[PDB]
Design a protein around this ligand. Structure first.
Ligand SMILES: Nc1ncnc2c1ncn2[C@@H]1O[C@H](COP(=O)(O)OP(=O)(O)NP(=O)(O)O)[C@@H](O)[C@H]1O
Ligand SMILES: Nc1ncnc2c1ncn2[C@@H]1O[C@H](COP(=O)(O)OP(=O)(O)NP(=O)(O)O)[C@@H](O)[C@H]1O
Ligand SMILES: [Mg+2]
Ligand SMILES: [Mg+2]
Lengths: 324, 330
């Protein structure tokens, strides 16, 4: 069987993601946790899969898949533990599927979680030749007293920003409409020694290792993963009803990729802040007394940290995240 | 947004699946589940699956309120065989254009399958991919997580010659072999609305949702020790039962110990399928296989039957002879 051929080829990829907790697929919880709470989430890649088909580039969308879930569970303080993926298609292409799952496993390695199982469904006729669908599922563990809830966020807290690797996994319907409209030279140098194509399909950044190392030394009051809805619709999810996150627009330069998308797309700036991450992949809220020490740590871990702004008292039905 | 509309419509359905372990409700970056020292050495058991080609019939007949039960059973029944209590569930729903009434119907069945299994439906994802799916069509993926004490993990390693093999009856073909069911139906055009069996139309028999074995099996585990279990999915009876059998044992099934249900009788005739090929393709009326000690077989059969199940004494375990196949039906 094709799927049986695929199962053997991916055994090496998954074997490198294993953890001592991995014993259906059985996972033990480390005695590290006294009162363990499980944090889980599911997601797909979105319309970025369309560029992966069109460009025949399948070895990175698996990193996008994993990041979408492990980064989501990360905001509660959870350490990612294990991951499962579901892969659906019409007729199985073992070399191309192997590439897809190889990237998944690679993203699991970077997140410190084990890829312990999955499912490859062949539905002949439901998918066009060459196309497929991906779903991922992540589970992490956090101590009950260490759950990051955002309830202590109050006026005076400083808003930090972790830089993103590009558009990540959101806003690609617009990126695709633009590219089909301009037919731009996708293989020309675009930024930081990467071609425009390389910048567009760049895999989503994982924040797991530096954020977890940070939590060993500091208290993080809240976090927001910047995905669907951009900055302004995602940060208010951890903010108390009475607080506003005020973002100074000049605290970070808009990366070149988003500068191109707004120009070509002719998008009002406030629509950009609610559509693309605009270079901000993860928002970390901390106490002002900790803001400097955390920024140095996260920068020393390899991240690019900005001081986006601070938390203030809300005035009425005021929007809870304003960039200006 | 359509998806924001769908999340609101399904929140009541998920709220009826909740358990005390679930912290918070639908909506939020992550879904929180506490375990509690109710478990001393807790082990998580998880699985993922889709519905398979049965969705094609769900499209054709415009019956979407039960394939979500099929989705749940495919995963919760899998983790059940290791002795795990299903705890929580997440679903992924992909389509081209979101049809909120139909999506509401699909997820409503998911919640119903979760309610019947005792697991909470705590989260999910609705992806709109315009152009990847024809109008009206969608894809389902589910993820189930259960808990078991490390010492109670059921592995089948103590299965030995002399143990009795019980069989739990199925509701039909469940979630496997449906590409073939569709080829047959599209060729013969049989009256799908005629009475066929047990006062149900043939259509009702074909699209019947997969049976959930969670509540009776977990209740059984309180009173008895189960040596092994098999959920009968792809590969039928003969390819799934040997998964829990030690290298040196064989499960011999007397074919006359249960009647092939009418639905499979029609599929064999219309498909012109060798009988030993049916045992490797369809569940043939056996949804779950339970192996127990011979001294417990009488009480276990009685208990599971009193819980609402149809129990057969499929056969017994014997010593394997060479490269002998580990499950033979005769
Ligand atoms: N896309 C995938 N990604 C990661 N692991 C996979 C994937 N597909 C299969 N596996 C694993 O390889 C093995 C293949 O088993 P599989 O053929 O999928 O049957 P099953 O999962 O037991 N249930 P079923 O889908 O009903 O046949 C399983 O252990 C999987 O966990
Ligand atoms: N099919 C579904 N079934 C159950 N719950 C769902 C489903 N779809 C969405 N939800 C829940 O409603 C909310 C949907 O918002 P969503 O945009 O999917 O959040 P997210 O984790 O940030 N993923 P994304 O924004 O796409 O990167 C989540 O909290 C889900 O738990
Ligand atoms: Mg997400
Ligand atoms: Mg969604």
């Amino acid at each position: 069987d094709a799927g049986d051929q695929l199962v053997e080829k991916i055994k090496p990829f998954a074997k490198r993601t294993m953890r001592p907790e991995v014993l259906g697929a059985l996972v033990e919880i480390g005695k590290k946790y006294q009162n363990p709470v499980l944090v889980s989430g599911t997601d797909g890649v979105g319309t970025k899969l369309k560029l992966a088909f069109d460009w025949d580039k399948h070895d990175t969308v698996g990193i996008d898949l994993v990041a979408m879930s492990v980064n989501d569970i990360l905001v509660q303080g959870a350490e990612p533990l294990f991951f499962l993926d579901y892969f659906a298609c019409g007729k199985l292409d073992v070399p191309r599927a192997t590439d897809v799952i190889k990237g998944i496993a690679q993203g699991c390695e970077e997140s410190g979680c084990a890829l312990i199982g999955g499912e490859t469904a062949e539905m002949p006729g439901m998918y066009p030749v060459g196309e497929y669908d991906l779903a991922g599922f992540a589970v992490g563990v956090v101590e009950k007293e260490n759950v990051i809830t955002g309830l202590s966020v109050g006026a005076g807290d400083m808003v930090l920003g972790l830089a993103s690797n590009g558009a990540h996994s959101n806003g690609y319907s617009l990126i695709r409409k633009i590219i089909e409209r301009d037919n731009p030279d996708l293989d020309a140098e675009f930024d930081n020694g990467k071609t425009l194509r390389e910048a567009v399909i760049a895999p989503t950044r994982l924040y797991v290792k530096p954020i977890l190392a940070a939590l060993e030394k500091f208290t993080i009051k809240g976090m927001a993963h910047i995905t669907g809805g951009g900055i302004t619709e995602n940060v208010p999810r951890v903010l108390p009803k009475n607080t506003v996150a005020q973002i100074d627009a000049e605290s970070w330069e808009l990366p070149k990729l988003f500068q191109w998308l707004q120009k070509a797309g002719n998008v009002e700036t406030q629509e950009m802040y609610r559509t693309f991450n605009c270079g901000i992949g993860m928002v970390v809220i901390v106490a002002a007394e900790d803001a400097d020490a955390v920024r140095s740590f996260l920068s020393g871990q390899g991240e690019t940290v900005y001081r986006l702004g601070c938390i203030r008292e809300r005035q009425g039905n005021e929007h809870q995240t304003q960039v200006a």
